[PDB]
Design an enzyme around this catalytic site. Structure first.
Site, PDB file in Angstrom:
ATOM      1  N   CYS A   1       0.816  -1.200   0.000  1.00  0.00           N
ATOM      2  CA  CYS A   1       0.000   0.000   0.000  1.00  0.00           C
ATOM      3  C   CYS A   1       0.854   1.256   0.000  1.00  0.00           C
ATOM      4  CB  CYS A   1      -0.925  -0.035   1.212  1.00  0.00           C
ATOM      5  SG  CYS A   1      -2.208  -1.281   1.085  1.00  0.00           S
ATOM      6  N   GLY A   2       1.746   1.377   0.966  1.00  0.00           N
ATOM      7  CA  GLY A   2       2.441   2.630   1.131  1.00  0.00           C
ATOM      8  C   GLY A   2       1.751   3.510   2.150  1.00  0.00           C
TER       9      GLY A   2
END
Ligand SMILES: Nc1ncnc2c1ncn2[C@@H]1O[C@H](COP(=O)(O)OP(=O)(O)OP(=O)(O)O)[C@@H](O)[C@H]1O
Lengths: 141, 114, 73, 56, 61, 104, 122, 120
Positions: B88-89
């Site tokens: 995702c980040g």
């Protein structure tokens, strides 16, 4: 690595935690593996928090040479999962409290085992006894 | 030590060429997802035009439907939709942390969020 | 058995009387420190220690004999 | 009959009032044990540490 | 239900008796901690002073 | 006043979420949020992947469509205070699917 | 290690273990940067499979018990190929991995697995 | 760097710096590849605080004014305890990485933070 093994260390620590070396090797790999910590298995969660607290047992202050019986104490405290439920970063305080508590309350343990080099049920009993007591003392507080 | 750092280089070649694979695959997923959204578009267009002219035609507020009636400030639920897969980040738990601050803002007035 | 005084070594990787374990590592990481610690661990074990200091600061060897004069070892 | 009914009603109401009062009193005794042992641990441990540092 | 509330009141008062009992026992354990801390400060001061003086005399020898 | 939290789609890197208010609804076009968002004309935008460089961006134009006042002569077999009671679940499902796929 | 000279099923055992093992040793750095849980399922099964495999073929020695704690085992090759025909196939994918840790035989691995599950309860 | 020489307080001060920065390096060599936010919230905060100490140790030099331009500053033991203390406690925990950059004194870092927050 020490390439002669348990035969050059005491039988008490032998019978307690011969296996702990390889357990901590697996904990080191799995903690490298637990970099990918999204949904850890519950058993590997137990294993990782276990070896976590074990590594925290292997912290010691500057030039405090513990009694070898005290090493037996902390090695059984680790291998018998009392510290598993306990606070994970206060294990050093748990250990200094526990060692003071046994060294005061039941100093007969360390002398009988240093005279026998063997982790017997008397050692177990005195250990778990002072473990209940000092676990209470440091839970409150 | 030369061969082993050479192999770290080779695995970094692997790593770049696999992140490229993930890049292109996520691009294909983005294309298919925007295709599905513009596929469900005319459904949306039809419903909003018929809804706008219906609530224009209604012309007086004798409409007691429980889904719309703006009632009192009880429990304010969170219909939060979150990340899909953990490459995702930042934004995809940043929505979670903004949701945490919204739980804080709902406990500001103490509205008993769900 | 021969005793370390340090916990983790006697825990996992034991030293024994006659066994020749090898401390290794980079500089400034406590090698001489753990050496002196496992020396002055030996206080009632009838263990002669021979700290052969090789090729370093005489100020450092004076520091370690100062620590030995402190610890009685 | 109305006196008997009012008697039973007011008696049960006072009983539940005292029930809530006794719950708050149990929490008050919990506060007693808590603050007592907490300040006691603080006093004993901090005094021991301060006198230890001074004598050291 | 009113009787269960009254019995719950009695249970709360029993827990309050337990709280007061553990309060008095905790104060006794605090006296114990003060006793062991007095003995510990005594042991620390006496050990440090006597051992340091004996080490000074060993330096003198 | 449900607080629906999908994540928006404005840029490829930082599409910050906004906290929708699904149920209850409002006047017809109004799908306002808690944070005064209020597009309020239920014609929305559609995201596309513009390609102005070697990299990509987002193409979203607030695509509108007409109010046809569909027919005065269209007859309501279910009493237009009653048909809306089932039409509004459809608006709910469409908004929740558009939020779902916008999050994806 | 020729198939005709080891038994053409023993050879298939050897090939399957070397295949999934080498693929894991390839995958492991991509794991170390992108997460196993991301790393796609048709290989996410094989990484855990071969991860069990290697630790299972760690087996204790009758002298190394000084270094391990448990006296070792003299393992028979039929028992070996049997346990691996369980693992590589994916019959014993239900077992925890550390049930394969340092175990002589696969039935003992099932026994240690039941012990591990028992202590997961206790 | 021994407790019985610098005071155990200064010893653990240096420790609580060094543990964090060594951890930052151990995370650095895998954060540079594959970006910032793949960490924990904890590890993200620890990276922030480690880079806090890093830019905080940017001692402006009194002789380097003729080379760079900034007339350097002098700091001591009250700084040695307190800048560490504010960083590790989280007193200074919202001022940016520039807000302790090239300033020795932590109060000077606070005043610099005031100035850069003022210029917006
Ligand atoms: N258990 C410990 N806790 C805290 N510090 C320790 C510990 N063990 C060793 N050290 C520290 O390691 C530092 C370096 O000591 P030492 O000189 O032995 O390292 P070294 O690698 O041998 O360096 P050199 O090789 O130059 O002598 C010492 O300042 C000492 O405080």
């Amino acid at each position: 690595v020490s390439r002669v093994g348990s035969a050059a260390q005491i039988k008490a620590m032998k019978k307690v935690a011969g296996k702990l070396k390889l357990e901590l090797a697996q904990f080191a790999e799995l903690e490298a593996f637990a970099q990918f910590a999204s949904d850890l298995d519950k058993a590997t969660q137990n294993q990782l928090a276990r070896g976590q607290r074990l590594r925290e047992l292997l912290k010691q202050p500057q030039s405090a040479p513990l009694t070898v019986e005290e090493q037996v104490m902390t090695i059984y405290t680790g291998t018998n999962g009392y510290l598993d439920s306990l606070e994970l970063d206060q294990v050093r305080k748990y250990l200094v409290e526990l060692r003071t508590y046994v060294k005061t309350n039941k100093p007969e343990f360390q002398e009988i085992i240093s005279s026998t080099k063997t982790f017997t049920e008397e050692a177990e009993a005195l250990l778990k006894e002072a473990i209940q007591e000092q676990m209470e003392r440091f839970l409150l507080q | 030590n030369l061969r082993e750092l050479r192999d770290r280089i080779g695995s970094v070649k692997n790593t770049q060429k696999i992140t490229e694979a993930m890049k292109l695959v996520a691009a294909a997923k983005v294309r298919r997802a925007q295709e599905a959204v513009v596929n469900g578009r005319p459904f949306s267009e039809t419903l909003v035009e018929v809804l706008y002219n219906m609530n224009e035609q209604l012309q007086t507020e004798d409409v007691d439907v429980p889904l719309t009636k703006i009632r009192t400030v009880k429990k304010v639920a969170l219909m939060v939709v979150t990340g899909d897969r953990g490459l995702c980040g930042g934004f995809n738990n940043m929505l979670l942390k903004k949701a945490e601050s919204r739980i804080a803002e709902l406990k500001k007035l103490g509205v008993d969020y769900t | 058995p021969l005793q370390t005084g340090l916990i983790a070594i006697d825990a996992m990787i034991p030293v024994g009387r006659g066994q020749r374990e090898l401390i290794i590592g980079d500089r400034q990481t406590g090698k001489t420190a753990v050496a002196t610690d496992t020396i002055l661990n030996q206080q009632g074990q009838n263990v002669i220690c021979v700290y052969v200091a090789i090729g370093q600061k005489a100020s450092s060897v004076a520091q370690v004999v100062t620590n030995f004069q402190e610890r009685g070892a | 009959l109305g006196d008997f009914m009012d008697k039973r009603d007011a008696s049960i109401k006072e009983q539940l009032s005292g029930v809530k009062d006794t719950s708050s009193e149990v929490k008050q005794l919990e506060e007693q044990a808590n603050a007592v042992m907490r300040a006691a641990r603080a006093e004993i441990s901090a005094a021991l540490n301060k006198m230890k540092k001074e004598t050291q | 239900t009113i009787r269960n509330s009254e019995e719950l009141r009695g249970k709360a008062i029993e827990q309050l008796e337990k709280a007061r009992a553990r309060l008095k026992k905790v104060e006794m354990d605090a006296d114990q901690f003060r006793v062991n801390g007095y003995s510990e400060i005594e042991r620390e001061k006496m050990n440090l002073i006597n051992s340091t003086y004996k080490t000074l005399e060993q330096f003198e020898n | 006043k449900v607080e629906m939290l999908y994540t928006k789609f404005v840029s490829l890197v930082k599409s910050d979420p906004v906290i929708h208010t699904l149920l209850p609804l409002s006047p017809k076009g109004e799908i306002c949020d808690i944070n005064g968002k209020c597009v309020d004309a239920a014609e929305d935008e559609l995201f596309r992947l513009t390609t102005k460089e070697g990299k990509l961006t987002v193409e979203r134009d607030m695509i509108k469509t007409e109010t046809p006042a569909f027919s005065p002569i269209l007859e309501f077999e279910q009493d237009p205070a009653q048909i809306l009671d089932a039409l509004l679940p459809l608006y709910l499902n469409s908004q929740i699917l558009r939020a779902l796929q916008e999050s994806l | 290690l020729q198939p005709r000279i080891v038994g053409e099923e023993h050879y298939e055992i050897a090939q399957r273990v070397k295949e999934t093992l080498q693929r894991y040793k390839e995958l492991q750095d991509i794991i170390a940067i992108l997460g196993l849980d991301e790393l796609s399922e048709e290989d996410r099964l094989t990484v855990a499979r071969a991860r069990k495999i290697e630790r299972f073929l760690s087996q204790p020695f009758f002298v190394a018990e000084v270094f391990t704690g448990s006296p070792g085992k003299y393992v028979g090759l039929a028992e070996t190929i049997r346990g691996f025909q369980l693992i590589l196939s994916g019959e014993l994918d239900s077992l925890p991995e550390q049930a394969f840790y340092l175990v002589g035989n696969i039935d003992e691995a099932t026994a240690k697995a039941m012990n591990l599950e028992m202590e997961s309860k206790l």
